Structures are given as C-alpha cells and as structure tokens.
Write an enzyme that holds these catalytic residues in place. Structure first.
Site, short mmCIF file in Angstrom:
data_model
loop_
_atom_site.label_atom_id
_atom_site.label_comp_id
_atom_site.label_asym_id
_atom_site.label_seq_id
_atom_site.Cartn_x
_atom_site.Cartn_y
_atom_site.Cartn_z
N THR A 188 44.34 14.96 -9.63
CA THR A 188 43.67 14.45 -10.81
C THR A 188 44.66 13.77 -11.74
O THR A 188 45.87 13.87 -11.55
CB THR A 188 42.93 15.57 -11.57
OG1 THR A 188 41.90 16.12 -10.74
CG2 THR A 188 42.31 15.02 -12.85
N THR A 189 43.90 12.89 -13.09
CA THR A 189 44.83 12.30 -14.02
C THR A 189 44.05 12.35 -15.30
O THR A 189 42.86 12.01 -15.32
CB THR A 189 45.18 10.85 -13.69
OG1 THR A 189 45.31 10.70 -12.27
CG2 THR A 189 46.48 10.46 -14.35
N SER A 218 47.01 17.01 -11.04
CA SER A 218 47.99 17.14 -10.00
C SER A 218 48.45 15.76 -9.63
O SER A 218 49.26 15.58 -8.73
CB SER A 218 47.43 17.81 -8.73
OG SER A 218 47.06 19.16 -9.01
N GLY A 219 47.98 14.74 -10.40
CA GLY A 219 48.32 13.36 -10.22
C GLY A 219 49.11 12.91 -11.39
O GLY A 219 49.70 11.83 -11.39
N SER A 220 49.13 13.75 -12.44
CA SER A 220 49.71 13.49 -13.71
C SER A 220 51.17 13.28 -13.67
O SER A 220 51.70 12.54 -14.48
CB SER A 220 49.47 14.66 -14.67
OG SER A 220 49.70 15.92 -14.06
#
Lengths: 176, 189, 214, 184, 198, 183, 190, 192, 189, 183
Positions: J1-2, J125-127
């Site tokens: 995610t972001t 977890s894309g951050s």
C-alpha cells in the site's frame, strides 16, 4: 547418571576421591562402581563415557609407555585426554576427567579437569571446599579435608553417595 | 524381566518366558536364555530383533575365538567384549536397546555375573535384575540376600521373587526358566 | 606403480638400499659431536662457481625447538624429508604439548625411511642425516641412514671420508669436552676430509653465529 | 511490541537531575518516527522518560497524567511506586507494557531516580541508563562514579552530553533543577 | 569473559581477564586466555574456551610450521587469513572467537575475528561477554597518538569495566604487550573452619 | 545495509557506507565494503560479511589467476559469472547481495544467485529507502561530475532512515587509469 | 535474576544476611538494593527469586500484617507468617510468584526463627537455610560448622560472614556488599 | 517421597522417609510427611510437597468443621471421600499427591491418589520408592502381626526403599494408629 | 475389562477386580461393580475418579427418582439417562472417559443390557464387553453364544472367556466378580 | 500500500493510490482510501481494509456525535485520539495504519496504536520507497501549489516499485471552505 569427582592438592600428597555408585535413572544400580582408574584419573559423567574414555586413554597411553619406558608427564596426559575428547566436538562424549597425581621424580602434584582443588561431576563441591582448603596439609590432614568435603557435598546430593574412595597419592604411601 | 544372584559356588540366573507386541503375548516359550558357552550365558531383555541380532553377533565371535584360540573366554572377558559393542552402537545409526546380564563362571577368578545397560554401562553385580519388573524385585533380593546362601536356598530366594511379578505387578509372566551355572557348567531348572 | 623396487639378493641383501648407502658415500662430509655443553653439527659446503649463496639451503635445518638435522647424500631428497620430520614434530606438539623427545622424532622419521624399503614404486631415501638433540639432562646425537636404521652416538661423522672422520673422533676425542672444545675436534676432523655449522647447547637450537665460526 | 524508541538516560546533579534522550521512535531497522519526544514532564519538577514500545508510553503518559491531575485538585517516589503497580498489573495478565522508564525528580533535597522495568522490577539508582546504554552508557556513568562517589551540577551534565555522543544526535536534554522541569 | 586489544603507537596491547565460567559457576578463577600462537603473535579467545584453545593450538602449530620453514617470522595478515578461513569453514560450529594481534615488519595489526569469519583490523577491539561495556570505554577514551605505557592505563581500566559491570567476566586482568621492541607477558597482572583431623 | 552503484563515463562511480552491525550493536564504523577483487574489478557486498569473506576472495583468487594466463584485465562479467557460480551452487548455505563493478560495468547478484546486469543498483536492507531518489534523478545527458554528488547524496538520505547504515560514505571511482576512492 | 539469602537463628539472633545486587540477566543494575527488608522491630524478610515479585509480595505481606494488627490488635506472630505466607504463595500458584523468601521475626520466647520457602509454599522452621542462586554452594558448608555450640554469636557472625566471601568469589550472582540483619531481643540489629 | 502404610490386627502403621528435593539438590531432610488432621486419623504426603500440605490443611479444616457441626467423628471412609472429591476438582491442574487416610474406626486404610483414586486396600506404599517398598512389604506382612514385628516391618520396608531411591533419604517416621489412636512410634534414623 | 451376556430369564455381567497406576496394581479388590438399584447395575471401566465421580452422580439421581416418584426406573430409562449425561460432557470442559455397561432387568420389557461408549453411543447389546481385553474376548462369546442358554450354562460360557485374559492377554486380571440379575434381583457369584 | 500525507496552507494536501489487493490478485482499482469521517476530518488507511471498515466508521459515528453536541467541527486530534483509543484497546485483534488529517493537521496512527502527530507521513508496505524523495523535497518556503505536484509525483515513484499500489492517484485537498479531491 553421573557421579562426583573430588580432587584436591595440598602438599606433595595429591588427594582425589569419588562416590561409588551409579544409577539407572533414579534407582541405584551398584554400590561399587569404579571411577578412579590408576598419576591417577577420575572420570565422572556418563558411565558409558567413563568406561569409553578410560579404555581409549589407557590404550593411547600404553602405546607411549611401551614406546618409552619414560613415565608420562601430567601435563602431557592432560593434553592427551584434551585432544581425545575434542575430536568429538560434533559428537562429544559426556564425561568429565579430573587427573590427579605426581609429576615424575620431582614429587610435584598436578591436578586438572577437562570439559588447589578441581571438583567436577554431577555436583555442592566448589562452594564447599574453597575456604576450607589449606595450602599445606600432611596426608593425615589432607584425608580429613577431602573426606569432609566429599561426605558433606555428596550426602546432600541425591544421585551420588553410598561409598567413598580416597587416594592420597605419595611416593611413600597411597592410602585408601 | 531377568534376575541374577551370585552364590558361593554358583551363579544363578532366571528369565520370564514371554514376549508381546500388541495386547497379547504371541508366545510363552520365548527364550531369553542366550547361552553362548559352557559357562558364558547372556540373558537379553529388549525389544525386537536387536536382542537376538545382537546376541548371536556376540555369540559367533565368542565361539569364533574358542576355535581360533583353542580356549574359552572369561565371564569378564566376554563382558568387556559385549560392552565394547554396545558403546559403539550408541554413537551409531543403530543404537541397540538390549539390557542384558552376562552370567559366567571363571574357575580361578570364580563365579561372576554382570549387569549391562543398553547404553553400555558394564558393572559387576552381586545380584541384579533387568526389565521393568526390576523396580519391584530388586528390593526383595536386596533385603533377603546375604553373603552366604546355597544353591538349595537359592531356589527359595528365587521362588519368593517370582511372587512379585504376579501378585503386585500388572503383567503376567507365568513360567520362569530358572537355570544355574556351577563349576559343572550350565543346567536347566 | 604398486610393486616395490626393493627385493632381496640371493643371500638376503637389499641391493637398492646398499646402493642408497653408496649415495650417502657421496655428498659433502658431515660431522657431529656430543660434548657436554651441547652437540655441534657441521658440514662442508663449497663456493663451487663463486656465484652461489650460502644462506639459501643450509644442510643445517632446525626441525623443532631444539632439534636439527645435517645431511650427507643427495640434497634434493633432504628438502622433503625435512618437511615430514617437521610434520611429525608439530603434530606431536599439538597432540602431546611438549617438544618431542629427540629419540622419538628420530624413531618416527626412521619409520618414514623404512616405508619406502617396503613400499611400491618408490626407491629408498639416499640421504643419511645426523639428528642432534638435547632434552632434560642429556645431549642427543643420532644418525638415521637409508634403510631407516638409526643409532645414537657420542661422536659420529658422515659423507665423504667418514671412514677416517670417525677414527679421529674416537682417538682425538673421548669422554666429555666443553662445547667449543668438542667443536675443536669438529673443525679438525672435518679438516681430514663455505662451511655451515649449527650447535645445540641449551639456548634454543642455534646456528653457530657466522662471526664466531671464524 | 510495535514501534519502539530507545536510549533514555538519567543521572543526578546535586540539586537537579539531568535526563537526556534521543528522539527516535524506530520501527524495525527503519527509523519511522525521527521526531518523538519521550521525556514527559510530570510535575513542577519530576519527569519520566521512556524507552520501549511507544504505545505504552502514550498510555502511561495519559494515565500518569490522570493520577497527577486527580491528586492535584483533591513525589517521584510515589510515582515510581505506582508505576511499578501499573507495569506489574499488566504483567499479571500477561499483557505487559514494553516500556522501561526512568523517573527523575528532585524531592526535598533528594534526587530520586527510579527505574521501572517492563516486567515490573523496580529500584532507585543514581545513574540510570535504559536500553542500549544499559550495556554501553552504563560503564561511562560508573567510571565517573568509581573515582568520585557523587556528581555535581556540571559533572553529570557533561557526562550525559558526551555519553549521548557515545539513535542520532537530536536528543533533548531535560534537566530537573532545584526548581525542576527544564528541557533543552 | 572480557578480552580486548588496542593498537597503540608501537604495537598492540592485548588484555584479558582471568575467569572462565561453566554457566553460573566459576570453574577457573585463573584462566589463561592470551594464548601464544607464536612469539611474535598472540591471540586472545572468547566464547567457548574449548574451541578457542584448540583452534588456537591448530593455528599455532600451523604458523610455527610456516615460520619454521621460511626461517622468517610470520606476518600478522597470514595469521588472520588462515583464521578467517578456519572460522568460516565450520560455519558456526566453531563458535569461539579470537582477537589476534601481532607485529611484522609491516607493523602492528589487531583483528577482532568473529566466529563466522570476519576479520576486521581496528585501533580498538573488544570481545567476550563484557565487550559492550568495554567498547564504550575504549570508544570514549582511546585516542590515536597514544603512547606505549598509557595503553597499560587504557586496557586495565577497560577490562576493569567488564570486570565489575558484567557477571560473566571477572578476576585479575592479564595484559600482554606486542611490540618489536620487547614482548611482555604479565600473567596475573592487575588486581582490581578446619576439618579437624583424626 | 546500503550499496549504491552507478555507472558512466570513464568508469563506474559507486559507493557504500561504513557500518557492519551485528544486530543493533555496531561492530565497526570504518569497514570498507567496496573492497578490491582485482585492479579493475572491485566487489561491493550485502548479505553477510562472513559469507562474503569466503566468496569474493575466492573470486579474487580465480580472477587474478584468470588474468595471469590471459594477460588481459579480466572481463567484468566473467568475474560476475564467478559470483553467479559461487552463489548459485550454494544459495542455501550462503547469503550474498554483491554488486560487482569493474572497468564501467555495474553488475549485481541477488542472494538466490542470478547475475543480472543493472545499470544502477542498490543493495542491502537500507537500500529500499533510496528508490524514490534514484529513479527520479538518473538521467541521460548527465556529465561525469553529476554522479559523484548523486551517489554521495543518495546514500546519506538512505542512512537517515536506515538504522543499519551510517558511518562514513565511501566512494569508489573505478575508471581507465585510476580508482579515486574518496570518503 | 536471583541472588543469595542466608539465615540462621539458634539463640536469640536470626541473622538474615544477603547480597545486595540484582542482575537483569547479567546487567547488574543497582548494586544497592537490600533483599532483607525490615517489617517490624522483629520481622525481617529476605526474598530472592524475582525482584519484581519480591517487591509486590513484601508489600502484600506488609499490608496483610497491618490488617492483622488492626483486626486483632496483637502483633503478627512469626509462626503466623509461616502458615500465612504459604497460603499467599498458593493464592497465585497457577501463575506463580518466583520468589524464595526467608522469614526472621523474633519469637515470644526470645529465640531465633528462620522459615524457608519455595515458590508454592514450604515453610520450614530450621536452624539454618540459604536460598537463592548460591544456596547449593552454601548449604553443606554452613551446615557443617553450625549443624556442641551454644550458638556462639561472635564466631557465628564470622561464620555467616566468611561463607559469603566464599560464595561471592565462586558464584557470579552473589557479591558486592553484604547486608546482615541480626534479630535480637533489643530489636532488629541491622 | 515414600510413605508406606499397612493395617494389621493391632494397628495401622504409617512410615515415611523425610527427604524432600528440588532438582538433584536436596533442600531438606526434616519433613514429616504424615500431616496431621485428627488425633486418631492422619494424612500422608507423596507427590509435590506444597500440595499435600495445602490440601490436608483444607482437609483438616473441613474435618474440623464437620466434627463440630455433625457432633461426631469423621470416618476414614468419609474423610478419604471428602478428600477424594476435593482433589478431583483440580484434576488436570497437576496437583499431584498420594495422600492416604489411615486410622482406627476396625482399622481403615484408604489410599487416595490425586486423580481421585480413593481405593481401600490394607497394604500400601506410595511415592517414588513405593515399588521398592512393596516388595519387602508383602514378604513379612501378615494380619497376624505383633506391634513390634510390624514396627520392624515398616522400618525394613522404608529402609530398603530409601536405599535405592535417589530422591528419598532421611529418617523413618512411624506413626502407629492402634485402637486408641496414633503415637510417634519411632522417628529413628536410616543412617544406622 | 467387563463382560455382559443376555439370557432367557437373566442378565449376566462380570468384572475384573483390578486397577493400576504405574507398573503395579495397587488393589485387586477394586469393584467395577456399581450397583444402583435392585435391577439397574452400572459396570464402569475407565481411568481415575471419572468412573466413580460419574457413577455415583448417576446413582444419586436414579435413587433420587425412586424416592421422589415411589418407583424404580427401567434399564432402558436409566440407560438413556446416563447416555444424556455423557453426550453433554463430550462438548464440555470435562469429557468423562468411562466405558460402561448398564445391566438391568425390566419385568414386562424383559432383561436388557446396554453397551455405552465414553463418547456416548448407547446401543442394546445381545452380549457385550468393554475394556481392552474386549478385542480378545468378544470373538469367543460371539462364536459360542446362541439364543438359548441357561444360567447354569452361562457360568461355563463365562468361565471360558476368563481363560483369554490370562492365557493370551498380557495383563493379569485374576479374580472375576461374576454377578447375575434375574427376576429375583442381583446376586453375587 | 501507499498513503502519502502532506500538510500546509489553507489545509492538508494528501493522497493515496487506488488498489486494494488481496495477495497478488487485485480486487479493485477504484477504491477511495481517503474517505471521509467528518466534513473536515477525512481518514486515510493502511493495515487492512477490513479492520479499517470497523474502525473509522465507528470514529465517524462518535465524531459526528461529537460535533452535534459541541456545535463546532470536531478537533482533529480528538478524532485522532479516538483512533488511538480504538487501536490501542485492540492492537492484537486489529491492524490499522491510519493517517488522519482534518482542518490542516496531519496525524498518524501506528498499528500498535500511538497517535503521533507527523507533519508529513507515509503509510503502507509501498511507502518505504518514497522516503528518499520526501525527505529531500519537504521545505519551508514552499507555496501551496508545490505540495500538489510533490504528493502527486511522490506517490507515482512509490507505485513503480510497489506491487501493491498502482491504480489512479487520488488526492484530497481539505482546507477552509473546500475539499478539492482530484484524481
């Protein structure tokens, strides 16, 4: 299993002592089981290893003792068992050898153990003997301190006791 | 269960005649006698082939020696031999689980029986027992037994131990293969 | 190969070993004396072309803390024999933890030289070498030879004209003599038949220091 | 335990208690919150710093503020005492707090410096350093104590100013002073 | 179990404590750890004492064989390279780690060597149970340009930091200087009822 | 960790940080991770230091033994192929995130062990934070000078977040006729 | 965590001595702690096992003995603590208090009291007991020179003292400063 | 932790070894296993040390509340039964013991295991060493037994148990519950 | 081990008198009889207190009913009652492990015995057995038993089953508490 | 995610991507993660969608029930405090990485549950890939216009590497007198 291995050095006399029992689990098997094999050695820990190391060591030692009639130095014997047990560092035999006895002809004691006094075994002993040790004892005394340390540490201990053997090595006499 | 007694001029050993896998015994004639010489006699409690796959492996050596040397080994000598084997197998892929009594009668060293742990912990035994009925019996024999005894008395001392295995113990081991070893050599009783 | 090149002569003599003793007869003379301060070993080596070096390959190579060797015979063979002698000594130190007794290193090395008088496809070692050592209260002077037979000596000689060198060593010397005094017989027995020298005493094995060889 | 700051120090100055702490609230190898101020200022002087999961610090910051705010309208030793009760009670359900906090407060000429372990272990100690200085800072604190048995205003001050250089250098240097409650 | 080393101007002061514990009991209050690999080079050990002693004996016989062969006293880097390999090959079965220090004409080198085989020379190194406590003192106090005698005043206090603060490490400091100038062993170096017969 | 490799001009410009932590406790801040395996070809590493000591040196052994016979500087991809082999055959008894460069030819090796030629790469567990800074800067038309400031500034931003990397930023410049290693 | 306690009372003294240090793992945190908290002019209680529990337990003991002291208005007997404390240990037993506590209150008969405990409750009047980490080291020796003495106090002080010198240089969890709390008819004698 | 008991025409004798242990360390050798509940009936202690004390404190309490309220003696049958019920509730909690109720009623000996095994025999030995103690026990035991011969039998059977059991050492502690009730018949040593 | 036989005008049930924890039996008088009425008789093999902590819990209800209603329950009725309890305990914190035979003799519905699984699987049994000696014995009784029989013959049929538990089975269960239930009500044998 | 939150001016400018993947299989590309919990206060989420549906709405319930009584727009930190409470009490039966904003006041909530006021934050977890781009751009002296291009370009770089984020970049603008949500 196990068993206790008292060992103590006061004056040229070299004390060593051991419990004479071994147990199959928590049940005593024998009230007589040799641990001090004659410059003496006293192994304790497993019985299988006690016997295995005693056999293997006497073998390697006799090949030397025939090859030179020169009696073994205590330090070299310490190296002999040190190397002998470190060969299994992947499959290590469980027994704790504590040699005790004279350096040849100089009447000089050498005690040591291997993974003043060196105690080893299933035991109770290291805290008991340490402030009682006198740096000078006649064998008459030496027997007394080691017999007290032996009996007091081991009577308390569950899995050791029921017979005591005490060799106080001297050229003049070896009391038991 | 196995039992052994050391007497003035004999060695007395006796064995339950049984084995069982499952809920039932599948034999009651099963010989835990493993006689190997005129006066060297293993008795091996333990599970499976290992008791006999070992026993015979010792036997054929102990016998091989007698042909090859022209004389018979001491009870001690045979004892230290089997002891050596069991120590080797402990570190091996196959650690045998055999708890055995090596009875024997040397002439000039005298009668001797030895307890031997499966791990391999030889010890001379004044009297000894093996099995799981050993926890029960060893007290009777430890109380009752003295230095003197007689082969005639040895029978009573042993008959009393038989009571423990039925009367207090769960398993039924019903016949006991009593045997003796005496200067004469082995006899069944 | 797998078949030994050592086989008895009709009366039982190891011909190839006897020829190895002939190879010992070659090589520059060696000499060694047990004096009572410490043994000395010494050997002829020569300029030869005047372009050589003298510190390159001593015949006097320390083996262990207080043992040394001096060879007579073929030089090439010595270089590897020394290697195994050092192997036995260091191996002994890690197992036994004392520098190996002189008598024992000589014995073990003798066994190495014996192996080829029974082993396939190999000739016996040509090199014969004095092995001089001092442990405990005694200076040790040994002679190992091509068959792997070895003897302790009080004084001994090797190489060319050992035959006379030993004769001088039994009449010009006997009993005991202070170490340089027993070097007197070395320098004067060697004279019968450049030079390297090495001494033992109890001062760590030692090469007699070059200014003092002079 | 979730995101965790570490490195809290405390030690007294005669008539004061320096307490410095860096301001990282790392979560894993990542230093997610390189902004957290971990030194709560409890009372006109006394104060806690916290080194352990920060959620637990938030809980006990708001709860210790509850106890003080209540009592005010109804001492560091008392706050540590209760704090041991709080850390202990959460251990009893096996739902602990992961916080390990030093409570420095000048009370009546005495610089109490409690330490309350997460699993409720508790003691006063003059030179406290919580984790990562509980093996590193701690000898540097002692080495001064091995020589001189007390620390002055200037001694403990410089001790912490250097010891914190021995995380990131962004640390706030809270300083109880005879008055109490400073922060730099 | 606090062993240490520092590279001072003329060489390496190795330092060690005399204790070995079998868990919670002290079995040896006079334990030798600054093992002589060679007269030139020395190696402290930590972790399991058995592995450390025996591995040091192996490298000793090895180094003393190579120097015995060339007749030239061996280099430090050599000692380290065979140590790197020796502690790598087992892959953590040799779980005892070593602090080797030595001097060769190339001058001083002191590599801490982790039991998986990382060799890192640095001016200060510490190891053992006490290492964290010791290294903070070595960090705070070590200065480059330190002299020869002040290192004695730099490892005895650093090791002392591990003696008091730690519970695996204690007893008399050993301190062994390494310089081509002189070698020093100070075996016990820094100290910080009758059962009536008959 | 942070391995930050960039290529261009005479040869690669690449860098790494200084710490070789074991857990949270730092062991060293002075470690050179950019270390040589040939005059041209200098390895960079991630995974563990311990597995990479066994590797790399063995590649130096083979590679410098590559060079003597062929009497040419060894091909960068040859060295990188040796890393693929060493890593490929034991990927399970090994951890290694190499980034091999040489002269410039940035090459990489994922621990699993596939040699995959990158043109710029980053390695470690500190590397990830860099991504948004590298991707938005790498550009065709940038001169040799640019890469120095780029790699040196990239790593520092990486280090700020990463609690495994810090130390001094050390840069190789490997090129024809020189290796300018700044710190 | 742990650490050693020791206690002997024959004649009037109940010498409860203990090492100060607590170790969380190995990180000796304060070297100034007492294990032998005083509760009453007569009551002194060593507590080894787990400090976090020891604190909580002793506060519960203090609260309970004060409750008694209100409820009966009669001083808490040492024998009452021996029977009381065991039930307190049982109260939290399926999650247990990892604590070994030695009691030393002065009797009504002006004699020493020692009461050994384990984590689930085994009160034992005895002539001596050492608990804690070094207890195995100290029991045979301390038993030998104490167990026809009139409980000689001066030699007994030396005998209590010396064994902790011996334990401190042998076991790594006994050490630093030794605190002794004799309990005599004059009161607790710290 | 051996606690033999057997009943015969002139009493019920209950002997117990005094050793108690944690690990292979022996904390004490002073405990008297036969925890008291009643002048004329008595407990035992086998299995964990604390359990037996606590349960038999609850037992002594409940027997006392009963003797006051019902205004009669609690019987060996009833005493063992309340005990058996109370230890059952904590079945699966590991509160393991081998308490026995003994006492003259004729004589009543009821072994009472922790899993609730309240069985009435006449001849018991309980604990680790019981398997040793049993074998000696049967061999002398007869209902035709004198108070002295029975004293010797209890002492021999405990002596042979402690001799082999590593975790059982300490002195034999006879209690004899004769017609009248129990007395501390012997506390005598094993190290004789 | 427990055994049950249904006869023309009787129900025959019998029980081994034993229990053992450890290697030994600790009693041989142990009554696996749990008689609960004049003609309702549980027999409960199973480990520990659960066999008797259950048995009595049923007994007191079965008895409580008789005082409260003035009449005695049917063997079926008592059976379905105990069946209900065991089903409840299976889903509970405490699932009892009791394998029991509820013998009984209704007058107008006639003699009946019921096998009951520990889980709770009531079933009317022409003949039944429980325990682990059940694997052995049930074949003898299944071969031999017929529709007719007699109480005189029931004794022989049962005496033959006793042989299996000694002669082929490992455990010694030596005395059998034979009992009958007949219009007369229960008797020991 | 972001989740990419930035503060400033009239009010926050912040954004999130469009995918709500379950495993590698995408379920949806149109998901609005920036969704309202008040007129001022609009939640952003990471952790799981499922735990965040239960949360947030319950915070809307309480917060909009906060607003009616007090007759003032609810304090942003009040809402954020409700997220600290909801997350704090079940941190173990929950996963939630919120980034609550409101009007601008960027607030965050680590799954463990501590409300910690950020001034710019990123979640998921894309951050992580963003870090090197945010830290090297956030600057005092940047006007309101800048943050739009900054957040919108930041997320895209994040998405390139992240295989959990993609979709359409959706931006809230929450401020006095308006919420300009572009996509």
């Amino acid at each position: 299993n196990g068993g206790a291995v008292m060992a103590m050095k006061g004056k040229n006399c070299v004390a060593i002592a051991a419990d004479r029992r071994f147990g199959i689990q928590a049940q005593m098997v024998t009230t007589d089981f040799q641990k001090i094999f004659p410059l003496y050695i006293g192994l304790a820990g497993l019985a299988t290893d006690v016997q295995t190391v005693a056999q293997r060591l006497k073998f390697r030692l006799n090949l030397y003792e025939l090859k030179e009639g020169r009696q073994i130095k205590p330090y070299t014997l310490m190296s002999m068992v040190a190397n002998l047990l470190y060969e299994k560092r992947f499959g290590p035999y469980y027994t704790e050898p504590v040699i005790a006895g004279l350096d040849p002809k100089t009447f000089k004691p050498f005690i040591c153990s291997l993974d003043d006094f060196v105690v080893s075994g299933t035991c109770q002993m290291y805290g008991m003997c340490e402030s009682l040790w006198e740096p000078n004892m006649d064998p008459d005394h030496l027997f007394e301190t080691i017999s007290q340390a032996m009996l007091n540490a081991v009577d308390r201990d569950a899995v050791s006791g029921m017979g005591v053997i005490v060799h106080i090595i001297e050229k003049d006499k070896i009391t038991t | 269960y196995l039992i052994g007694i050391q007497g003035p001029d004999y060695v007395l050993v006796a064995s339950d005649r049984v084995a069982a896998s499952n809920i039932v015994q599948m034999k009651d004639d099963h010989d835990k006698m493993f006689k190997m010489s005129e006066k060297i006699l293993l008795l091996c409690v333990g599970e499976a082939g290992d008791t006999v796959q070992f026993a015979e492996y010792i036997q054929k050596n102990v016998q091989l020696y007698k042909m090859r040397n022209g004389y018979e080994l001491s009870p001690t000598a045979a004892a230290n031999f089997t002891r050596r084997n069991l120590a080797d197998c402990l570190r091996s892929r196959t650690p045998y689980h055999v708890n055995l009594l090596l009875a024997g009668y040397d002439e000039h060293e005298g009668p001797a029986l030895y307890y031997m742990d499966y791990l391999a912990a030889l010890a001379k035994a004044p009297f000894a027992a093996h099995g799981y009925g050993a926890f029960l019996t060893l007290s009777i024999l430890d109380r009752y037994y003295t230095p003197t005894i007689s082969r005639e008395r040895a029978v009573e001392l042993l008959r009393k131990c038989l009571e423990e295995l039925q009367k207090r113990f769960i398993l039924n081991l019903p016949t006991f293969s009593v045997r003796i070893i005496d200067k004469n050599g082995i006899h069944d009783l | 190969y797998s078949f030994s090149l050592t086989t008895f002569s009709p009366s039982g003599k190891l011909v190839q070993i006897e020829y190895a003793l002939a190879a010992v007869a070659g090589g520059a003379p060696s000499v060694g004396i047990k004096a009572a301060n410490g043994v000395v070993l010494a050997t002829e080596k020569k300029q030869k072309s005047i372009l050589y070096d003298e510190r390159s390959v001593h015949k006097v190579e320390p083996i262990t803390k207080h043992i040394g060797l001096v060879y007579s015979g073929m030089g090439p063979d010595y270089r590897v024999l020394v290697h195994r002698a050092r192997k036995l000594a260091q191996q002994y130190y890690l197992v036994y933890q004392e520098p190996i007794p002189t008598a024992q290193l000589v014995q073990r090395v003798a066994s190495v030289m014996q192996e080829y008088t029974q082993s396939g496809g190999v000739r016996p070692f040509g090199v014969s070498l004095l092995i001089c050592g001092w442990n405990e209260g005694r200076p040790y002077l040994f002679q190992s030879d091509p068959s792997g037979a070895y003897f302790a000596w009080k004084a001994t000689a090797m190489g060319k004209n050992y035959v006379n060198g030993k004769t001088f060593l039994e009449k010009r010397y006997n009993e005991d003599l202070e170490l340089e005094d027993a070097i007197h017989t070395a320098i004067l027995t060697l004279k019968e038949s450049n030079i390297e020298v090495g001494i033992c005493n109890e001062a760590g094995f030692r090469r007699l220091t070059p200014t003092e060889v002079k | 335990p979730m995101v965790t700051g570490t490195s809290v120090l405390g030690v007294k100055f005669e008539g004061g208690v320096v307490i410095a702490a860096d301001m990282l609230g790392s979560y894993g190898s990542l230093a997610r919150f390189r902004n957290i101020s971990r030194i709560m200022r409890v009372n006109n002087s006394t104060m806690l710093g916290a080194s352990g999961d920060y959620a637990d610090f938030q809980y006990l910051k708001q709860v210790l503020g509850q106890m003080v705010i209540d009592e005010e309208l109804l001492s560091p030793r008392a706050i540590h005492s209760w704090l041991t009760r709080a850390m202990y009670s959460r251990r009893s359900k096996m739902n602990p707090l992961w916080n390990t906090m030093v409570i420095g407060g000048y009370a009546d000429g005495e610089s109490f410096l409690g330490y309350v372990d997460m699993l409720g272990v508790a003691y006063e100690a003059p030179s406290l350093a919580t984790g990562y200085g509980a093996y590193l800072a701690q000898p540097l604190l002692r080495e001064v104590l091995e020589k001189q048995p007390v620390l002055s205003q200037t001694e403990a001050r410089d001790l912490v100013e250097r010891c914190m250089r021995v995380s990131y250098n962004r640390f706030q240097i809270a300083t109880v002073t005879e008055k109490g409650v400073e922060i730099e | 179990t606090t062993i240490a080393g520092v590279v001072y101007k003329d060489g390496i002061v190795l330092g060690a404590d005399t204790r070995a514990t079998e868990g919670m009991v002290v079995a040896d209050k006079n334990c030798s750890k600054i093992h002589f690999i060679s007269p030139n080079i020395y190696c402290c050990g930590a972790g399991t004492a058995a592995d450390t002693d025996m591995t040091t004996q192996l490298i000793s016989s090895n180094l003393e064989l190579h120097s015995l062969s060339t007749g030239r006293l061996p280099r430090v880097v050599t000692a380290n390279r065979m140590l790197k390999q020796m502690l790598f090959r087992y892959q953590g079965y040799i779980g005892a780690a070593l602090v080797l220090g030595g001097v060769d004409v190339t001058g001083p080198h002191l590599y801490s060597i982790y039991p998986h085989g990382s060799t890192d020379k640095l001016p200060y190194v510490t190891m053992g149970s006490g290492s964290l406590a010791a290294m903070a003192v070595f960090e705070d106090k070590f200065r480059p340009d330190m002299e020869e005698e002040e290192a004695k005043n730099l490892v005895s206090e650093a090791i002392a930091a591990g003696i008091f603060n730690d519970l695996g490490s204690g007893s008399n400091i050993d301190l062994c200087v390494i310089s081509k100038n002189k070698l020093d062993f100070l075996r016990p170096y820094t100290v910080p009822y009758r059962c009536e017969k008959g | 960790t942070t391995i930050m490799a960039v290529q261009f001009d005479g040869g690669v410009v690449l860098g790494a940080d200084s710490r070789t932590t074991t857990g949270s406790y730092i062991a060293n801040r002075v470690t050179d991770k950019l270390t040589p395996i040939h005059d041209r070809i200098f390895c960079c590493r991630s995974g563990s230091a311990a597995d990479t000591q066994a590797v790399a040196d063995a590649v130096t052994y083979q590679l410098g033994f590559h060079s003597i016979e062929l009497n040419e500087p060894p091909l960068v991809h040859t060295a990188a192929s040796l890393f693929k082999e060493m890593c490929y055959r034991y990927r399970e008894d090994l951890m290694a995130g190499i980034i091999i460069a040489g002269w410039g030819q940035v090459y990489s090796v994922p621990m699993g062990g596939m040699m995959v030629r990158q043109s710029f790469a980053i390695g470690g567990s500190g590397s990830s934070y860099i991504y948004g800074y590298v991707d938005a800067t790498y550009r065709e038309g940038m001169t040799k000078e640019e890469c120095l400031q780029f790699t040196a500034n990239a790593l520092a931003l990486a280090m700020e977040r990463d609690g495994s990397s810090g130390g001094v930023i050390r840069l190789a410049a490997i090129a024809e006729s020189g290796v300018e290693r700044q710190v | 965590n742990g650490g050693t306690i020791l206690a002997i009372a024959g004649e009037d003294f109940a010498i409860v001595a203990s090492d100060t240090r607590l170790s969380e793992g190995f990180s000796i945190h304060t070297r100034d702690s007492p294990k032998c908290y005083k509760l009453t002019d007569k009551t002194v209680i060593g507590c080894s096992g787990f400090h976090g529990d020891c604190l909580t337990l002793t506060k519960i003991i203090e609260a309970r003995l004060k409750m008694y002291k209100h409820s009966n208005n009669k001083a808490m007997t040492t024998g009452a603590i021996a029977a009381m404390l065991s039930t307190i240990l049982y109260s939290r037993r399926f999650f247990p208090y990892y604590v070994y506590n030695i009691i030393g209150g002065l009797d009504e008969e002006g004699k020493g009291a020692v009461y050994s405990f384990d984590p689930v409750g085994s009160y034992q009047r005895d002539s001596f007991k050492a608990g804690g980490s070094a207890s195995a080291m100290l029991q045979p020796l301390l038993d030998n020179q104490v167990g026809h003495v009139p409980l000689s106090l001066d030699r007994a002080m030396r005998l209590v003292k010396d064994v902790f010198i011996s334990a401190a240089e042998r076991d790594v969890y006994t050490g630093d400063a030794l605190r002794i709390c004799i309990v005599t008819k004059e009161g607790i004698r710290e | 932790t051996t606690t033999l008991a057997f009943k015969f025409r002139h009493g019920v004798i209950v002997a117990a070894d005094s050793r108690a242990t944690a690990g292979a360390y022996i904390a004490s050798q002073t405990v008297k296993k036969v925890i008291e509940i009643n002048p004329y009936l008595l407990g035992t202690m086998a299995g964990g040390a604390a359990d037996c004390s606590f349960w038999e404190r609850l037992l002594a309490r409940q027997c006392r509340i009963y003797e006051l309220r019902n205004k009669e003696r609690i019987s060996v049958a009833a005493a063992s039964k309340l005990l058996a019920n109370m230890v059952y509730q904590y079945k699966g909690m590991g509160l393991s013991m081998g308490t026995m109720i003994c006492g003259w009623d004729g004589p009543g000996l009821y072994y009472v295991d922790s899993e609730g095994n309240r069985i009435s025999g006449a001849t018991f030995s309980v604990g680790s060493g019981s398997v040793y103690a049993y074998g000696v026990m049967d061999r002398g035991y007869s209902y035709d037994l004198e108070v002295e011969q029975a004293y010797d039998l209890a002492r021999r059977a405990i002596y042979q148990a402690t001799y082999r059991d590593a975790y059982s050492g300490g002195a034999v502690n006879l209690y004899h519950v004769r017609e009248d009730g129990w007395i501390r018949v012997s506390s005598d040593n094993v190290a004789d």
